[PDB]
Design a protein around this ligand. Structure first.
Ligand SMILES: C[C@@H]1C[C@H]2[C@@H]3CCC4=CC(=O)C=C[C@]4(C)[C@@]3(F)[C@@H](O)C[C@]2(C)[C@@]1(O)C(=O)CO
Lengths: 241, 11
């Protein structure tokens, strides 16, 4: 009887703390290793959030696993895009309150491009003047937005879970065609914006020279994900063609 | 199948 929107509100994780010590010199290897460590933690937080998600637990495990594996990057980039929108109006990446990345430190090697792609997400929030509630329902739909070409085990429970959150975003729009059209195209563009961050992730993950550290959690997710993208057996759910 | 993620979901 409390609305689904108010439940999403209370399972929303409190932002994690990085512990980045900008007392030492900034380097791109260090900063990337810190992002990934903060990332591995954010992801554990996002598993708890998914587990608390009305309906999510009703999928088979193979499905629950598939969905977090295929959307973790999308989840974290979407939240980062929000944090940057709220805390700095989309000007600077707010990775944590103790880690912001201004164009001083976009100027480090490797950083500019990947920080541009991330800011892009941020500026879409700025363009559309997204609400908090819009963001929350959209974020759930991100979790449900990439599936295997062979489909899921429990496709049935899945289709009805997506149905619920589609309605919920609908609600969120109105407690505030065209709007819904715009937001679902924003969802559609997350696959493209996120494919490129994934690609940079995979690059840093495999490149020996660069020595970027990943936590064991991520490393196993990324290691199992890299073959499936090689094969192109990963299917985006799109609202629009 | 990635073992930590797997173990976290079946707790
Ligand atoms: C461009 C990529 C995409 C980045 C990820 C973008 C999404 C994200 C948001 C966060 O708030 C926490 C960390 C992550 C989950 C991430 F920021 C770090 O992992 C660093 C990352 C992979 C990246 O910068 C690297 O691959 C560096 O290794």
């Amino acid at each position: 009887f409390p609305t689904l929107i108010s439940l999403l509100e209370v399972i929303e994780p409190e932002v994690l703390y990085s512990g980045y010590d900008s007392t030492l010199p900034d380097t791109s290897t260090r900063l990337m290793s810190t992002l990934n460590r903060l990332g591995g933690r954010q992801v554990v937080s996002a598993v708890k959030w998914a587990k608390a998600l009305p309906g999510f637990r009703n999928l088979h495990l193979d499905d629950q696993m598939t969905l977090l594996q295929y959307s973790w990057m999308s989840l974290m980039a979407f939240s980062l895009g929000w944090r940057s929108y709220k805390q700095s109006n989309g000007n600077m990446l707010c990775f944590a309150p103790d880690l912001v990345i201004n164009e001083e430190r976009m100027q480090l090697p490797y950083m500019y491009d990947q920080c541009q792609q991330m800011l892009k997400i941020s500026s879409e929030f700025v363009r559309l003047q997204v609400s908090y509630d819009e963001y929350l329902c959209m974020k759930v739909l991100l979790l449900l937005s990439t599936v295997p070409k062979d489909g899921l085990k429990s496709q049935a429970v899945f289709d009805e879970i997506r149905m619920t959150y589609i309605k919920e975003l609908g609600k969120a729009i109105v407690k505030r065609w065209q709007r819904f059209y715009q937001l679902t195209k924003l969802l559609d563009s997350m696959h493209e914006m996120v494919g490129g961050l994934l690609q940079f992730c995979f690059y840093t993950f495999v490149n020996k020279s660069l020595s970027v550290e990943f936590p064991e959690m991520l490393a196993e997710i990324i290691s199992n994900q890299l073959p499936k993208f090689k094969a192109g057996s990963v299917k985006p759910l799109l609202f629009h063609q | 199948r990635p073992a930590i993620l797997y173990a976290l979901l079946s707790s």
